[PDB]
């Protein structure tokens, strides 16, 4: 049984700084990619997807290409007040018709101090 753990309930950064959203998985099973979202539900915003998508503001804390990697923390650079919100670390599994969400973290609230 894999768990998605976000050790930070909330985070405060200044505008222009970097936001580090921490997330660790407890298992490699099941196989599947990790995705980051801002918000939950149907209209949630895709923040990161390790297999497809354009996310030039996001860098991974660790090397996700390593087979035994379980750190899925990301860094969002040049934070502005518009980046404030709740970010969820989500584990996906292989399914039909596309990848299917397996488990989501409890979320990390990002708040920003403006300039």
């Amino acid at each position: 049984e894999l768990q998605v753990i976000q050790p930070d309930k909330s985070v405060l950064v200044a505008a222009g700084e970097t936001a580090t959203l921490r997330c660790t998985a407890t298992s490699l099973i099941p196989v599947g990619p990790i995705q980051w979202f801002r918000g939950a539900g149907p209209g949630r915003e895709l923040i990161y997807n390790q297999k497809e998508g354009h996310f030039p503001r996001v860098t991974t804390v660790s090397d996700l290409t390593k087979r035994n990697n379980m750190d899925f923390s990301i860094r969002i650079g040049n934070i502005t007040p518009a980046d404030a919100g709740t970010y969820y670390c989500v584990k996906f599994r292989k399914g039909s018709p596309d990848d299917v969400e397996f488990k989501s973290g409890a979320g990390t609230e990002l708040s920003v101090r403006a300039k």
Epitope: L46, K51, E52, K94, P97
Partner: antibody, heavy 113, light 108 residues
């Protein structure tokens, strides 16, 4: 730098088959989904499918299901697109893509007797 | 699959003219909406991602907007190098689809 190099133009007789190639550099295809797109002069861009080269899982648009077969080889860092029973409606430019901003230069496939 | 209707399919704008390209969806789409610029003889280039964010190298005169079932691409001041075909793209619903595209010419 990321780059996708596709195979040369192909001429296929109607009813026959062809396998297109796509070799990547600057990254390992094992780490990303590799997509295939076709573009016809009168039907625009159409997503054919993708493959996860890490486990070989393939997805397809229902239009190209029995028509397209996508394979990948992590050793040679190359993805392949096999097309069967090619009709004149399959004459198009076929693109290789790591989804987002990384595309191949395209491969012309003319289906004519 | 989602129908992305780009109308008009061909339009013209003079240098310095503000131009807006529209993309209407048969069903709702989310931040999976990309815009691709394509010129003859070249691959599609990612231009706008996640509705309003410019890809690297895209001039600041470009901007994107929209939500739900209607989106837009806008050039504040038309330039000659902006003459191309622009396709809107969604990949929030399976399978991912493209619009038929709007060809944009410069009115010299």
């Amino acid at each position: 730098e990321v780059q996708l190099q596709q195979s040369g133009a192909e001429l296929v007789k109607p009813g026959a088959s062809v396998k297109l190639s796509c070799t990547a550099s600057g990254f390992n295809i094992k780490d990303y989904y590799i997509h295939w797109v076709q573009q016809r002069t009168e039907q625009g861009l159409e997503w054919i499918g993708r493959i996860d080269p890490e486990d070989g899982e393939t997805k397809y648009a229902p239009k190209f299901q029995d028509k397209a077969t996508i394979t990948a080889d992590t050793s040679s860092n190359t993805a392949y697109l096999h097309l069967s029973s090619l009709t004149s409606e399959d004459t198009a430019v076929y693109y290789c893509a790591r989804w987002g901003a990384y595309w191949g230069q395209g491969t012309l496939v003319t289906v004519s007797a | 699959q989602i129908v992305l209707t780009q109308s008009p399919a061909i339009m013209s704008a003079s240098p310095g003219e503000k131009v807006t390209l529209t993309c209407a969806s048969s069903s709702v789409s989310s931040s999976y909406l990309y815009w691709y610029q394509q010129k003859p003889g070249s691959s599609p280039k990612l231009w706008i991602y996640s509705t309003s964010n410019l890809a690297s190298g895209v001039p600041a005169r470009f901007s994107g907007s929209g939500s739900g079932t209607s989106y837009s691409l806008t050039i504040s001041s038309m330039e000659a190098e902006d003459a191309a075909s622009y396709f809107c793209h969604q990949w929030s619903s399976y399978p991912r689809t493209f619009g038929a595209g709007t060809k944009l010419e410069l009115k010299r």
